[PDB]
Design a binder for this molecule. Structure first.
Ligand SMILES: [Mg+2]
Ligand SMILES: [Mg+2]
Length: 477
């Protein structure tokens, strides 16, 4: 075997205030490829079937014909219960315009937060194929989001993901972004990313849902340069996707996970033996200098933690990160803390194309398990971290969603932004399927979480495929 021993992990809980960061190591990450098989043409899937998202039909419906929809989150509480209001289900999505001239892959800097609603508890025979979502439109008033950036030079602004907390009964945590780009789309000045809070009121009658408020935006967090990488340290830094939750182990407190980057100057040779995570005599180890020479120093993802410094939840303090992937992958996005069986699962999304040199894995969801919000997190499924990937041959090149390589599974980029719901249901959006780009919700799927491993449930729905955009409420608010 050419694949190394994975770095062991205890699941041990630390104090949330402790400077301890669990490492998603190269030796961990390399288990994905190790666990895989060389696909058997006509087979274009290397992944264990248990870790594969089933194939989404190319005839998928739009969520709305007039809107591009991608990152989505439900109406929820700090317990991650999904909430209906007066018999209505409510979701929030990043939205953009398909006919405004810009292509799907440049949608990001034009993103606005919209909402959709529909009646809860409708059976499949009465739900339309597109999930029956009614477009509510833009959640925030024009210009409310961009106020945070005062007078700075900018060539666009956008609203990026977070979460909705019913508590003005509704708090929308999200990422305000500002960009200053030239002709070629190079940064004149480093992008600005600020985790913000806007409060408003959901209202409904028998015929619709609507909101008021969200007029006054509260800036909460931007990178410090000590735990989380600033624009000045790295023009291509990431800082976004707040998930706000209560840890029952820590009442009187409210916490937040979010995507960050390790705070170093871009190009620093700052990876250690810890990030590689080999045993000394493992024949399949790697040399640190060899790894840093490959350019893996440009891949320095982390998941951060913050805690409310008041009851108002209007003031937040940074804690040390709870997970790094230094020299493994530059993106750990939309992190969430999922409570099951008295355990803590950290789920986070990542891209095949953001892996460091010498490491490889699919687009989809990665999971880690521990005894606390800050653990020596155990990477799920063979100490790999992969929970659920798009069907992918890791023995062939990635391609891109705008340029599909026909040596590669045409559904390698079929879904992204996997969000884990109560009972292990997973919602996501469709990126590329063959020539077609989605901007629409994927079929909901279901994973059975079983201690250190997970299984895609193929008895769920249509051989694992539930309804398009099936994001259901558990609880009335
Ligand atoms: Mg308008
Ligand atoms: Mg690669």
């Amino acid at each position: 075997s050419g694949y190394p021993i994975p770095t062991p992990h205890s699941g041990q809980a630390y104090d949330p205030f402790a400077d301890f960061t669990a490492k998603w190591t190269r030796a961990n990450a390399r288990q994905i490829k190790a666990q895989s098989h060389v696909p058997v043409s006509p087979d274009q899937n290397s992944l264990p079937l248990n870790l594969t998202m089933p194939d989404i039909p190319a005839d998928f419906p739009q969520t709305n014909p007039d809107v591009w929809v991608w990152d989505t989150w439900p109406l929820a509480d700090v317990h991650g219960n999904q909430l209906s209001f007066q018999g209505w289900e409510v979701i929030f999505s990043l939205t953009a315009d398909p006919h405004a001239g810009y292509v799907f892959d440049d949608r990001h800097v034009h993103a606005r937060i919209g909402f959709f609603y529909r009646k809860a508890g409708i059976p499949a025979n009465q739900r339309p194929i597109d999930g029956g979502w009614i477009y509510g439109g833009h959640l925030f008033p024009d210009g409310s989001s961009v106020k945070v950036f005062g007078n700075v030079p900018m060539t666009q602004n956008a609203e990026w993901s977070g979460g909705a907390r019913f508590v003005n009964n509704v708090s929308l945590y999200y990422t305000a972004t500002s960009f200053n780009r030239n002709a070629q789309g190079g940064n004149i000045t480093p992008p600005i990313a600020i985790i913000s809070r806007a409060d408003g009121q959901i209202q409904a009658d028998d015929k619709h849902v609507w909101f008021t408020g969200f007029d006054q935006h509260l800036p909460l967090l931007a990178p410090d340069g000590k735990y989380y990488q600033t624009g000045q340290q790295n023009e291509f830094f990431s800082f976004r996707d707040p998930y706000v939750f209560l840890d029952p182990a820590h009442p009187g407190k409210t916490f937040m996970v979010f995507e960050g980057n390790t705070a170093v100057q871009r190009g620093s040779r700052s990876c250690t033996e810890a990030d590689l995570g080999y045993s000394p005599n493992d024949p399949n180890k790697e040399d640190l200098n060899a790894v840093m020479d490959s350019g893996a120093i440009y891949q320095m993802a982390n998941v951060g933690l913050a805690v409310a410094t008041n009851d108002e939840l209007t003031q937040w303090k940074f804690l040390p990160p709870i997970l790094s992937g230094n020299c493994v992958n530059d993106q750990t996005e939309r992190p969430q803390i999922y409570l099951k069986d008295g355990k803590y699962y950290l789920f986070t999304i990542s891209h095949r194309t953001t892996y460091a040199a010498g490491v490889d894995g699919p687009d989809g969801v990665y999971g880690f398990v521990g005894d606390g919000i800050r653990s020596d997190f155990i990477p799920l499924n063979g100490l790999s971290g992969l929970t659920l990937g798009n069907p992918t041959d890791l023995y062939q090149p990635a391609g891109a969603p705008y340029a599909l390589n026909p040596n590669q599974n045409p559904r390698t980029f079929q879904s992204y932004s996997h969000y884990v719901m109560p009972g292990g249901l997973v919602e996501s959006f469709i990126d590329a399927i063959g020539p077609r780009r989605g901007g629409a919700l994927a079929p909901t799927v279901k994973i059975n979480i079983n201690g250190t491993s997970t299984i895609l449930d193929r008895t769920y729905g249509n051989a694992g495929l539930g309804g398009y955009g099936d994001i259901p409420a558990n609880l009335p608010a």
